[PDB]
Amino acid sequence: LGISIKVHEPPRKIERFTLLQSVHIYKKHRVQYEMRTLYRCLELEHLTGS
Amino acid sequence: VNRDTTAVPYVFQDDPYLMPASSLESRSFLLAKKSGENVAKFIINSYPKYFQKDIAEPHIPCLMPEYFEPQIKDISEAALKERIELRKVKASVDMFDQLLQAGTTVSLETTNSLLDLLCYYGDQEPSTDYH
Amino acid sequence: PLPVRMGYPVKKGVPMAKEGNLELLKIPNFLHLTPVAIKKHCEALKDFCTEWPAALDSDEKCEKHFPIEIDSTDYVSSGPS
Amino acid sequence: HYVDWRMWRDVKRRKMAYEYADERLRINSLRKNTILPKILQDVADEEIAALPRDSCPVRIRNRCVMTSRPRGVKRRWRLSRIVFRHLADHGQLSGIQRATW
Amino acid sequence: SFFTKLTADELWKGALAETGAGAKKGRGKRTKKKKRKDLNRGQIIGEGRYGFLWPGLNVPLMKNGAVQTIAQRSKEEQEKVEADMIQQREEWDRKKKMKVKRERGWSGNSWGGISLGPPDPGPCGETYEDFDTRILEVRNVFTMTAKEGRKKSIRVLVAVGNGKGAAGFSI
Amino acid sequence: KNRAARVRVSKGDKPVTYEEAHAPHYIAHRKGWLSLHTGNLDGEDHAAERTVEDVFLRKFMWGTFPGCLADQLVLKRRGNQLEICAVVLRQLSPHKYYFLVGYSETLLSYFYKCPVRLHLQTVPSKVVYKYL
Amino acid sequence: AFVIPKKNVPTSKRETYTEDFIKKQIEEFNIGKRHLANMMGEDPETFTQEDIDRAIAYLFPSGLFEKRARPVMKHPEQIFPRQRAIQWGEDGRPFHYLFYTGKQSYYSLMHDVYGMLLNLEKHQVIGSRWLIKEELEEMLVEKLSDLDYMQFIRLLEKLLTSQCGAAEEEFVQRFRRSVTLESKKQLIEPVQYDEQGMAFSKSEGKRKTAKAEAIVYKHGSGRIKVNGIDYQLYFPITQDREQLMFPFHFVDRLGKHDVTCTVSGGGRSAQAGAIRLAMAKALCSFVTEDEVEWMRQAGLLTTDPRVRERKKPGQEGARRKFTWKKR
Amino acid sequence: KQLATVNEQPLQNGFEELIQWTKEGKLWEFPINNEAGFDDDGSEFHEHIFLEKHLE
Amino acid sequence: NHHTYAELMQTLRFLGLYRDEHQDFMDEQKRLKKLRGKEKPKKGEGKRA
RNA sequence: GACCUGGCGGUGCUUCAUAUCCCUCUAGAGGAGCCUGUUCUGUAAUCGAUAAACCCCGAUCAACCUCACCACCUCUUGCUCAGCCUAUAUACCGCCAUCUUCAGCAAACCCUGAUGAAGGCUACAAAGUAAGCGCAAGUACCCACGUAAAGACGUUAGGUCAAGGUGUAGCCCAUGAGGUGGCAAGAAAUGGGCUACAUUUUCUACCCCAGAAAACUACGAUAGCCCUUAUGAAACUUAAGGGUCGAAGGUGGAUUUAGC
Ligand SMILES: [K+]
Ligand SMILES: [K+]
Ligand SMILES: [K+]
Ligand SMILES: [K+]
Ligand SMILES: [Mg+2]
Ligand SMILES: [Mg+2]
Ligand SMILES: [Mg+2]
Ligand SMILES: [Mg+2]
Ligand SMILES: [Mg+2]
Ligand SMILES: [Mg+2]
Ligand SMILES: [Mg+2]
Ligand SMILES: [Mg+2]
Ligand SMILES: [Mg+2]
Ligand SMILES: [Mg+2]
Ligand SMILES: [Mg+2]
Ligand SMILES: [Mg+2]
Ligand SMILES: [Mg+2]
Ligand SMILES: [Mg+2]
Ligand SMILES: [Mg+2]
Ligand SMILES: [Mg+2]
Ligand SMILES: [Mg+2]
Ligand SMILES: [Mg+2]
Ligand SMILES: [Mg+2]
Ligand SMILES: [Mg+2]
Ligand SMILES: [Mg+2]
């Protein structure tokens, strides 16, 4: 389409949290979950509204 | 894009087991799908309470339940117009007669709308989903 | 029409075939955005575009003629709202 | 049809708290300042104290929407740790995996 | 609550209690063992308690060359369908209650003298249809293992013979 | 011992699918997610409502197609659209499938107020990954 | 008769891929290979295996960490396991005189090597590694034991030690693989020149969470600037200044170079350690090759991998456990 | 309604289904605007910010 | 809204369009308890008085 | 009477344990104050865990609510095509502890013991072949290292009917539902932790070249008392800050924990 585009990758973000592994007691034992968020930044330039 | 010659019409499920394999299956498969849609619509209108939680933004009017019963219970000319808009041939006539017996004035326009509804349908209830 | 296979193979096994393969069903494929389709799509979309003013070649020229800059953001998420 | 009577009591509390939120906010503003006369602020103290008890927002409890567990609930998903793990361990929560590092 | 309902597999697995601590070291008796019953066996898709007739699911799609409309079975007609369903269940249940007459061996509860049928055919199209097998002894031998303690094994003595001079036995 | 979502070894006669054969520590290594939406991304909202919808849809489809589903659902959300991809069996007649597709697509579109599509893939029998 | 519940079709049902099945899989790959080229708009005749992988990666994007779980489109010969052909004909006579051993391929090889040794007796390295076991099994398409592998390699060594002919040496080379030995030689930085024509070499360093960039000038007076600040001011602690001196002192070049470095992150000691690495790597351009090797053998060119260890749940620290109570 | 029936045909491809939904208002209109369909009674900015008129 | 979910799926079951494996399980159990005599008593006219 | 298998032996020999058994190395606990569990005792007044494998444990959490407890009062087809935190974790699913800081569990065959319970290896080889599962390999994090994760079959009828579901039994004018108010204390004992006993210290500036303090006005409470503020409808009670106050404590008995 003739658009000027530059691509760069921002650093990823990992959010981690811990939960109890058993239904009852056993506090020493945990299960840890994470959600990874990856990014890609597309930078267009000199565009018109249309 | 152009028509894909190898594929059956898009309406059908693109699966070897479900793809229609004859001119009769083609018709029956669509009719079965339409029947399913009709059954769902019947349930949606039969139990509006279950489908009244609007979570769509922007609001989608077409995905809301339809209310076909007259909500104005007063015996008046303005209340009769509702039944004519709802196409209740029997309710409109019964109400129109009751209105005329009470002696309240019915506008010519309202009576004309009643004739339009009655003349078009021949004094027969329009087909409904189910009673 | 591709003999694509997916799945961690068992010992002395091969990745599962494509029929009934739920791993391939879980992928967000790009079969509708092949290089041929993209080029054909953009050819039909050129009629909707307008030409950037040639005078505004550099950012310094943009600042001279248009001193104010307004930033706004739109968020595309999945869901009913 | 809620999980239990405890969930049902919280459902009513959340409903009553919503109905009285504006009235409670308006009266509290009269109390949370040193501008208005203390005589007027004392009448406001009684007015907000006379509102129904279940209209007090502090009485609401974030229970698990699936099992009604009052503790171990994750606020982002509104699920108890046991229910969240059941869904996460089966691969049914988008983007949530086991953390190892 | 609709969100607390489990599937049939989870419900039967818990109710049957086939895997537990009471079935490891002869800790539970065999009399109160309950049997799984598939509750989806006689159920038809589209059949409900109200008796609606859905064209294309419960009933045929087209009747007399015309698409059928939504209909509902009359009260008395639904009672017949409900009564028949109860009868069908009772018959199926009756079949399971019936006990097949088992030809007893030397005693009612003894394994000795019971025919096991002909030996299984070989992998290369070999057949032993002439040979007959009969159990001679069934014993519950035991060994001791470090992890589980008593480990129950079965020792079985059988004899095979075609009745024309050829006969053998094995353990 | 860990129990979560682990089909336990038997005598070598229990057929398991590819999803059932992988324990939770493979959810981003050997198997993917059965649902794809943005709620659980950083800075995104409404993760709670997306989860309740997923739990309901999986139960609705299990009871609406009794005995037909050959594996777990794949729930896809793109913008306003909701896409349900189900691997079903080839036992129920096609007429009954088409009825249930039109019925479930319509009933769910009015319930969650969004365009819903149901994409059925038929298999002759359950795809066995291994015998445990 | 008491009917023993009969076994169903074998559940294990080990999948065997007959030669006809493989032939049909190859035809499928060749036909699918042409569609993939048509999809991507490339020439069907020059579409290689590396373009197939690039196309599948785009069309079926999979982020699974394990690459063996990702979608693949490879030639059936590389996918399916190599299966040995039928070893006996219709009459039932096996084709190999050592068939009844169960290891006809292995024992036939042992027989051949033993024969060569007999004839040799009657007639009379660093890059190459002896073929490993898992790789020898593939050649023979036989399952070998660890001791069987040993026996075979011992026989080859006996062959190699004794004088061998042109033919014997070629046979031995069939079971030797190539080892590419990595060189532990430091890579010198490219000497650059500034606007004034002064030689300098930029490099990088890393220590814990600190990262330094050092510019070492070929000629100087011994001035070091850290983040635009003189080094004694930026590093008041003597230990930090000692580390900055270690690279230059070891090569005996104190007072002959001017350094300008920028370090961010970490603490004072981690920053001093990062700058030490950056300066040492940059200074390698101006020292001799032999001096660079001494710098490497002294520990001045190695990135220290010792980073903080994470804390695990159920414990007080990385290794510290909670107080244990026997009772 | 009869004039609509004569031109009525089944959906031919995926694009046509998207078009029908867009016309019916089921599918979102792109490019995505987060305020599509929501107007605060056409209120001006001065109405929200300057509220002293009401304190007279 | 647990009322909407529970009531909707109960109506769909009575209509024949939803198979509730759970509700079927507790209908068979409740049916076998009547044949066994463990039937729910009449309210008010209970064992106690 | 004689055996098979396992366990056990204050059973022999040989080789080993790498934060590990001993000798060694470093900082702690056991003494003091305080915080917080538990046991006892107390209260009209929850429940569960409670050798290793309980004891800042279910709780990433109790002023009302939460709540399941107690007293009094009220309701009876009841938020639900009811309900029950009623009994039974010794009926179970679900999710886990533990050996595991292990490497074994093995279907299907074959052979040995005279066709007994059982057993099956020797590489210059003598009956074992073995799918599968675990280990391993791969993958995550900063590497091929390390740490995570993983860790089968079984053992302790180990933990959990009080996450939820649920078999059996029991309640149905009550063992169900709602309202108001209220208890959650310390004779005493004890686990874990926090802060100290100080000079490698205390205070201030600084963030490492300083000036003072340094034993009855020193070091030392995050306790007590008073006041204020924060959240809340509700604070003598929860939290923060200030003032006031300046206690035991002077390095800790038997014994005991962690770290490559
Ligand atoms: K101490
Ligand atoms: K202590
Ligand atoms: K129970
Ligand atoms: K109370
Ligand atoms: Mg609260
Ligand atoms: Mg008898
Ligand atoms: Mg564990
Ligand atoms: Mg530490
Ligand atoms: Mg102490
Ligand atoms: Mg207690
Ligand atoms: Mg107890
Ligand atoms: Mg507490
Ligand atoms: Mg309370
Ligand atoms: Mg109760
Ligand atoms: Mg137990
Ligand atoms: Mg490693
Ligand atoms: Mg671990
Ligand atoms: Mg491993
Ligand atoms: Mg017990
Ligand atoms: Mg107990
Ligand atoms: Mg009661
Ligand atoms: Mg101090
Ligand atoms: Mg104080
Ligand atoms: Mg206040
Ligand atoms: Mg003092």
Coordinates of C-alpha atoms in Angstrom, one line a residue, chain F residues 10 14 17 28 37 52 54 59 70 74 86 96-97 102-103 123 131:
Chain F
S10 CA -3.3 -49.1 33.4
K14 CA -6.9 -47.6 27.9
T17 CA -6.2 -38.8 23.1
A28 CA 3.0 -24.6 26.7
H37 CA -8.9 -14.8 24.0
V52 CA -17.6 -18.1 32.9
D54 CA -16.0 -20.8 28.4
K59 CA -21.2 -27.9 29.3
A70 CA -14.8 -37.0 20.2
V74 CA -11.5 -25.3 20.9
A86 CA -15.7 -29.4 17.8
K96 CA -29.7 -34.2 13.2
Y97 CA -26.3 -32.5 13.1
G102 CA -28.5 -24.1 13.5
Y103 CA -30.1 -24.5 16.9
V123 CA -13.9 -38.4 12.6
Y131 CA -2.7 -46.9 24.9

